[PDB]
């Protein structure tokens, strides 16, 4: 086509979606990880995770307001990944990298799994 | 704005 | 912070949100423009437009599944802008620039209004 | 991936 493109549009959209999350506006699901609860937008979860994409395209699970993750999933690893989904920023540290990689493999977030494998290989 |  | 960043994350998120729109997955509103109907995600509309942000943060309008725009709004101008919201790409042409600018002013999409003003000033 |  003969379209023009606004370079910062996608980043600005994601910034506003994170502002809506922080104010709990139009969140439509709660992700339960052990004792911890995380509110989010199903569309953003699907856009970032192969696991959530599969869950919310299912004709029965698409209507659930609560999703319980596998009890092996660490709440901190999930929190770091949820923050990454809404910001593009990953808080990867020596003390959390194993929990982050395991959570990213479960959530099917290929690019996060790739950077965790590379950072572990370096050490 | 750019030409993509 | 000490975060790392994935450059393509925001663009990849927006690409997936457009894939969901194209398949009519988790769309939660229909925007009526004269005789024409457009399905979309309220969160994406809010993230891109000052008008939709105001509408869906309203305690009564947040629950509406149908929004009717002002009858002066041109369906083609709206379609071009909805496509821009989900792609960052604007199909700006000599034959549609006046309708696109008027629709962007109504929708409160400041960056689109700015490029339309500049393209009109050049001609 | 980059240092933002
Ligand atoms: C694959 N596909 C057509 C598609 N359409 C829409 C959405 Cl929201 C979607 N999201 C999704 C699927 C798989 C994966 C991801 C997002 C991230 C990832 O590493 N794997 N994937
Ligand atoms: C202004 N604010 C705190 C905010 N938070 C969340 C959202 Cl979704 C939002 N969106 C929005 C508001 C105004 C405008 C836009 C989006 C685009 C524009 O040109 N004006 N604006
Ligand atoms: Cl990823
Ligand atoms: Cl804009």
mmCIF file of C-alpha atoms and ligand atoms in Angstrom, chain A residues 16-17 19-20 23, chain C residues 43 45-51 53 108-111, ligand 2:
data_model
loop_
_atom_site.group_PDB
_atom_site.id
_atom_site.type_symbol
_atom_site.label_atom_id
_atom_site.label_comp_id
_atom_site.label_asym_id
_atom_site.label_seq_id
_atom_site.Cartn_x
_atom_site.Cartn_y
_atom_site.Cartn_z
ATOM 1 C CA UNK A 16 -2.017 3.211 27.665
ATOM 2 C CA UNK A 17 -3.005 -0.442 28.104
ATOM 3 C CA UNK A 19 -2.237 2.643 32.502
ATOM 4 C CA UNK A 20 -5.648 0.910 32.228
ATOM 5 C CA UNK A 23 -6.173 1.676 37.394
ATOM 6 C CA UNK C 43 -9.284 -1.226 25.385
ATOM 7 C CA UNK C 45 -10.140 2.133 21.109
ATOM 8 C CA UNK C 46 -9.343 3.827 24.495
ATOM 9 C CA UNK C 47 -5.582 3.425 24.000
ATOM 10 C CA UNK C 48 -5.801 5.268 20.610
ATOM 11 C CA UNK C 49 -8.571 7.857 21.034
ATOM 12 C CA UNK C 50 -9.282 10.601 23.587
ATOM 13 C CA UNK C 51 -12.996 10.310 22.696
ATOM 14 C CA UNK C 53 -11.051 6.924 26.488
ATOM 15 C CA UNK C 108 -9.221 13.105 19.495
ATOM 16 C CA UNK C 109 -6.256 11.352 17.792
ATOM 17 C CA UNK C 110 -3.719 14.192 18.064
ATOM 18 C CA UNK C 111 -0.855 12.638 16.024
HETATM 19 C C1 LIG E 2 -4.526 10.385 29.619
HETATM 20 N N1 LIG E 2 -4.491 9.023 30.256
HETATM 21 C C2 LIG E 2 -4.065 8.980 31.688
HETATM 22 C C3 LIG E 2 -4.820 7.830 29.536
HETATM 23 N N2 LIG E 2 -4.811 6.609 30.194
HETATM 24 C C4 LIG E 2 -5.270 5.540 29.522
HETATM 25 C C5 LIG E 2 -5.729 5.636 28.222
HETATM 26 CL CL1 LIG E 2 -6.348 4.303 27.471
HETATM 27 C C6 LIG E 2 -5.685 6.911 27.573
HETATM 28 N N3 LIG E 2 -5.943 7.041 26.244
HETATM 29 C C7 LIG E 2 -6.078 8.250 25.478
HETATM 30 C C8 LIG E 2 -6.436 9.519 25.999
HETATM 31 C C9 LIG E 2 -6.287 10.707 25.253
HETATM 32 C C10 LIG E 2 -5.748 10.596 23.951
HETATM 33 C C11 LIG E 2 -5.378 9.330 23.402
HETATM 34 C C12 LIG E 2 -5.535 8.143 24.134
HETATM 35 C C13 LIG E 2 -4.827 9.537 22.020
HETATM 36 C C14 LIG E 2 -4.906 11.068 21.844
HETATM 37 O O1 LIG E 2 -4.530 11.748 20.898
HETATM 38 N N4 LIG E 2 -5.478 11.626 23.016
HETATM 39 N N5 LIG E 2 -5.227 7.997 28.236
#
